[PDB]
Design a protein around this motif. Structure first.
Motif, PDB file in Angstrom:
ATOM      1  N   UNK A 156     -14.877 -50.884  51.643  1.00  0.00           N
ATOM      2  CA  UNK A 156     -15.629 -51.953  51.034  1.00  0.00           C
ATOM      3  C   UNK A 156     -17.054 -51.669  51.531  1.00  0.00           C
ATOM      4  N   UNK A 157     -17.980 -51.458  50.606  1.00  0.00           N
ATOM      5  CA  UNK A 157     -19.360 -51.209  50.986  1.00  0.00           C
ATOM      6  C   UNK A 157     -19.443 -50.135  52.087  1.00  0.00           C
ATOM      7  N   UNK A 158     -18.658 -49.077  51.935  1.00  0.00           N
ATOM      8  CA  UNK A 158     -18.666 -48.012  52.922  1.00  0.00           C
ATOM      9  C   UNK A 158     -17.966 -48.231  54.260  1.00  0.00           C
ATOM     10  N   UNK A 159     -17.208 -49.306  54.420  1.00  0.00           N
ATOM     11  CA  UNK A 159     -16.493 -49.494  55.683  1.00  0.00           C
ATOM     12  C   UNK A 159     -14.990 -49.652  55.429  1.00  0.00           C
ATOM     13  N   UNK A 160     -14.186 -49.154  56.366  1.00  0.00           N
ATOM     14  CA  UNK A 160     -12.724 -49.204  56.267  1.00  0.00           C
ATOM     15  C   UNK A 160     -12.222 -50.508  56.843  1.00  0.00           C
ATOM     16  N   UNK A 161     -11.855 -51.432  55.955  1.00  0.00           N
ATOM     17  CA  UNK A 161     -11.420 -52.772  56.355  1.00  0.00           C
ATOM     18  C   UNK A 161     -10.072 -53.191  55.794  1.00  0.00           C
ATOM     19  N   UNK A 162      -9.543 -54.278  56.351  1.00  0.00           N
ATOM     20  CA  UNK A 162      -8.266 -54.840  55.908  1.00  0.00           C
ATOM     21  C   UNK A 162      -8.620 -55.960  54.950  1.00  0.00           C
ATOM     22  N   UNK A 163      -7.838 -56.084  53.886  1.00  0.00           N
ATOM     23  CA  UNK A 163      -8.087 -57.105  52.874  1.00  0.00           C
ATOM     24  C   UNK A 163      -7.046 -58.236  53.000  1.00  0.00           C
ATOM     25  N   UNK A 164      -7.471 -59.467  52.733  1.00  0.00           N
ATOM     26  CA  UNK A 164      -6.553 -60.601  52.796  1.00  0.00           C
ATOM     27  C   UNK A 164      -6.625 -61.415  51.508  1.00  0.00           C
ATOM     28  N   UNK A 165      -5.645 -61.233  50.629  1.00  0.00           N
ATOM     29  CA  UNK A 165      -5.615 -61.981  49.379  1.00  0.00           C
ATOM     30  C   UNK A 165      -4.827 -63.258  49.616  1.00  0.00           C
ATOM     31  N   UNK A 166      -5.379 -64.344  49.100  1.00  0.00           N
ATOM     32  CA  UNK A 166      -4.825 -65.676  49.282  1.00  0.00           C
ATOM     33  C   UNK A 166      -4.492 -66.381  47.968  1.00  0.00           C
ATOM     34  N   UNK A 167      -3.272 -66.904  47.864  1.00  0.00           N
ATOM     35  CA  UNK A 167      -2.844 -67.626  46.668  1.00  0.00           C
ATOM     36  C   UNK A 167      -2.370 -69.045  47.048  1.00  0.00           C
ATOM     37  N   UNK A 168      -3.113 -70.058  46.600  1.00  0.00           N
ATOM     38  CA  UNK A 168      -2.757 -71.454  46.861  1.00  0.00           C
ATOM     39  C   UNK A 168      -1.481 -71.813  46.107  1.00  0.00           C
ATOM     40  N   UNK A 169      -0.677 -72.686  46.711  1.00  0.00           N
ATOM     41  CA  UNK A 169       0.547 -73.169  46.060  1.00  0.00           C
ATOM     42  C   UNK A 169       0.239 -73.570  44.584  1.00  0.00           C
TER      43      UNK A 169
END
Ligand SMILES: CC(C)(C)CC(C)(C)c1ccc(OCCOCCOCCOCCOCCOCCOCCOCCOCCOCCO)cc1
Ligand SMILES: CC(C)(C)CC(C)(C)c1ccc(OCCOCCOCCOCCOCCOCCOCCOCCOCCOCCO)cc1
Lengths: 255, 257
Positions: free
Chosen positions: B192-205
């Motif tokens: 993401x924008x040149x950095x190696x990161x962890x992604x957290x996708x969130x889905x509301x009930x």
């Protein structure tokens, strides 16, 4: 065909179960009718086609009034239309009408429409306690909406509160995870009958919570110009309860 | 004045705390901005007026990307205007930008607007944060002030650890079920924008339209307004579905009349 199909998905009016006296039961969920959104004739027709297979024989009706307010009212002309459209025997075959969760707004609505509601006969049975419904319909035969049933779970009950107004009234304040319920500990008359009223305020309608002192608090309710004011020996504990409840709600709302 | 005064009430941009490097900290809550409903200039003005007293000295920004999606996007001309509306020193003075809860959509927004975000790629000043704890570390003796709604998503979580999101390219994820939402956190990093990161996708009930159990090892989730359904693989799928059905039922039981 569009909006009509929709009324069935809504579950405003549906058949479910059989009473202890052997008659099929129907449920009318008053809060699901929105005065200006839903077309009156459609609802009348949907009720008609639902009852038609049954109304030439004895049948019973459960009116679920929980959280019923002005936004769910049957306007004067619509109200009287209800009493003219179905055949006469259809009204004669209603063996019993159970009134569940009647509240203050509904009581006023019946006083204002008193001239007309006269018809309702020892056929009206007010269910002043969710248990007493069993005295007419076995528990397992009951089919009140799941959302209504949910309002009864995990309640923190404060007895001996006093609601202050022109006329003070003894009440019990019940705080659940999604709502505050104020139940009268004294009977009033609704249609010639003595009953306990149950006013319900969803966390989403509580605009303000004020602690006046150790034994008095108020609640500002959406669309109500005058605050609700109560007295109780444990008002700070009651206020804490309602704050926690409304805070849990706010933290769960849409972005 | 009646429309502008409301932005403070929406809590989109607020000041709170001091970094360990000793500089004030400002919080931008991405999901709280709704494009095409809030006069873009008004957000800039509200942000401008709240930084004015401080932007001549070094300051820091925490961007909460929790649940950020297309309804919260900065449109091209607005995103561009954000780079030309502030006084030069005000940018240099941004000592650090902490990025919390970056997700799949924000990553895609970033690839798509790559041209206007060029100066952010590879910046030493962008710090991607995993948990409220790692953010607190940079703040005075761990005193982070992320929105309470964001911190509530962090508690009493039932965590399923070695799931596999299925797609053209499969992804290792952990599936977390909370009382109000489901979170799909990547187990592998991506750019993401040149950095190696962890992604957290969130889905509301509330966005969980349908749930389907395929095999004992597979389930599908249909999310409102997203065409392609999500499908995961995991040995305990029956339990993952049971837990999400519970969360969805409770939500439905509380909707308005
Ligand atoms: C309120 C508005 C809602 C009015 C109130 C509480 C008087 C009412 C409740 C239910 C209702 O309808 C049930 C529909 O059943 C149709 C069959 O007719 C016979 C008796 O109905 C009572 C009508 C009015
Ligand atoms: C997304 C839409 C939201 C875009 C994204 C992730 C690029 C973004 C992140 C932060 C942001 O900042 C608002 C902070 O205002 C501070 C002003 O300083 C200049 C740049 O900040 C980074 C805007 C857009």
């Amino acid at each position: 065909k569009e909006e009509f199909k929709a009324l069935k998905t809504l579950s405003i009016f549906y058949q479910a179960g059989t009473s202890k006296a052997g008659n099929p039961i129907f449920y009318y969920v008053a809060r699901r009718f929105k005065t200006g959104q839903i077309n009156g004739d459609l609802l009348i027709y949907h009720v008609l086609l639902t009852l038609k297979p049954y109304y030439a024989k004895p049948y019973e009706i459960v009116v679920d009034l929980t959280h019923t307010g002005p936004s769910n009212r049957f306007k004067t002309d619509f109200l009287s239309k209800w009493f003219v459209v179905f055949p006469g025997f259809a009204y004669d075959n209603v063996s019993a009408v159970y009134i569940y969760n009647c509240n203050s707004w509904v009581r006023e609505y019946t006083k204002y429409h008193e001239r007309l509601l006269t018809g309702l006969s020892k056929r009206l049975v007010f269910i002043d306690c969710p248990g007493k419904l069993a005295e007419h319909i076995e528990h397992e035969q009951q089919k009140l909406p799941a959302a209504t049933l949910a309002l009864e779970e995990d309640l923190k009950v404060f007895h001996n509160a006093l609601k202050l107004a022109h006329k003070d009234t003894k009440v019990s304040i019940k705080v659940g995870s999604t709502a505050v319920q104020v139940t009268s500990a004294e009977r009033t008359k609704v249609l010639g009958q003595s009953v306990f009223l149950n006013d319900i305020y969803y966390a989403s309608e509580i605009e303000e919570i004020c602690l006046v002192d150790e034994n008095q608090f108020t609640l500002t309710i959406a669309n109500q110009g005058t605050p609700l004011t109560f007295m109780h020996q444990e008002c700070e504990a009651i206020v804490q309860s309602i704050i926690h409840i409304r805070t849990r709600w706010e933290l769960s709302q849409p972005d």
